[PDB]
Amino acid sequence: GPNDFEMIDKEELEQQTDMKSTYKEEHPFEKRRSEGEKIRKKYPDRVPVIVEKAPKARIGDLDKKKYLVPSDLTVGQFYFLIRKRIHLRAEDALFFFVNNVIPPTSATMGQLYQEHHEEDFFLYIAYSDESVYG
Amino acid sequence: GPNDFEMIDKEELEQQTDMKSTYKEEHPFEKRRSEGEKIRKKYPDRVPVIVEKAPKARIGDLDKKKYLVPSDLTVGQFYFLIRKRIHLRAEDALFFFVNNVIPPTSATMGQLYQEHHEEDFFLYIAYSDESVYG
């Protein structure tokens, strides 16, 4: 409601410790929100995901950071598809982080997007060789 | 199924960074699980909550750690009632952390317990004067 009070709640301060994103640094919020809003409108069966390396990760690079992922793929299948894009062995460690936390491997990409997408309509994922974002 | 393979999942490694608890260090898991199962059976309308101070918190002490909380109380109301037990002013900073994260102030204690109780059936909350757990 335009004339209703907006509650400011302590948990918003979690954003003080959000994961680093060069993507966010290079692109202003309004352009990001524009593109993610347009792409969610255009591929509603898919979610847009920015996949970036964690600051101290010792792990092979990824060419593209922007992915349109079917919303019914699990996180585990996404591990496989990113691993295949990085060209990692099955044994090479690969960890995802959403809001600094390893997401459930059973979870769907659509459920992660619904719960953790940002106000620019993008889901941000960091990847590392280690199990702690750092 | 006992004869079925148990999935070992990457997100379990989140527990490597679990918040400190003097309670868990002083009481072995099996005694805690016994008490949390018995107390969940006796009080189905309530959730058992362990409230302990964060390692770096500069904040008044709590005489008791063990609380039986009605599961329909909000996080905001639980803030108020813990505030009343510490005897803090309204304007004195007080933050809760569940699994290192500030919970939603609108969430119910029962929901928080459902998503975040540990295998001893206790919900663990740390409190601090600062907005980041440390």
Q: How many CA atoms lie less than 13 Å away from A124 in the CB half-sphere? A: 18
Beta bridge partners of A85: none
Closest residue on chain A to B101 (Cα): A14
* Collapsed DSSP state (helix, strand, coil) of residue B120: coil
Instruction: Tell whether A92 is within 8 A of chain B (Cβ).
Output: no
Cβ-Cβ contacts under 8 Å, B102 against chain A: 10-11, 13-14
Alpha helices in chain B (DSSP H): 22-26, 29-42, 75-86, 109-116
Place of tokens 């079917």: A70
Residue from the list B9, B16, B105 with its beta carbon closest to the beta carbon of A9:
B105
Residues A26 and B123: their CA atoms lie apart, in Å, by: 41
Identify the CA nearest to B134 among candidates A17, A97, A56: A17
Cβ-Cβ contacts under 8 Å, A13 against chain B: 102, 131-132
Instruction: Tell whether A16 is within 8 A of chain B (Cβ).
Output: yes
For A54, the enclosing helix (H) or strand (E) is: none
Instruction: Tell whether B106 is within 8 A of chain A (Cβ).
Output: yes
Cβ-Cβ contacts under 8 Å, B101 against chain A: 11, 14, 101
Residue from the list A7, A13, A103 with its beta carbon closest to the beta carbon of B131:
A13
Residues A10 and A109: their CA atoms lie apart, in Å, by: 27
* Collapsed DSSP state (helix, strand, coil) of residue B84: helix
Cβ of B16 within 8 Å of Cβ of A132? The answer is: yes
Instruction: Tell whether B91 is within 8 A of chain A (Cβ).
Output: no
Resolution in A: 2.0
Q: What are the tokens at A56?
A: 């101290």
Mutation choice for B interface testing from A10, A19, A101 by most B CBs within 10 A: A10
CATH architecture, domain defined by B1-134: Roll (3.10)
Residues A40 and A50: their CA atoms lie apart, in Å, by: 14
Residues A51 and A125 sit within 8 Å (Cβ to Cβ): yes
What residue segments make up the domains of chain B, in order of their start? 1-134
Residue A6 Cα distances to A1, A114, B113, angstroms = 9, 22, 27
- The values of phi and psi at residue A113, to 5°, are -65, -40
For B104, the enclosing helix (H) or strand (E) is: none
- Residue count of chain B, please give it: 134
Residues A68 and A79: their CA atoms lie apart, in Å, by: 15
Beta bridge partners of B56: none
CB environment B108-129: b (16+ within 10 A), e (fewer): bbbbbbeeebbebbbbbbbbbb
Query: Mind telling me how many Å the CA of B93 is from chain A's nearest CA?
Result: 10
Residues B51 and B82 sit within 8 Å (Cβ to Cβ): yes
Alpha helices in chain A (DSSP H): 22-26, 29-42, 75-86, 109-116
Instruction: Tell whether A22 is within 8 A of chain B (Cβ).
Output: no
Cβ of A11 within 8 Å of Cβ of B105? The answer is: yes
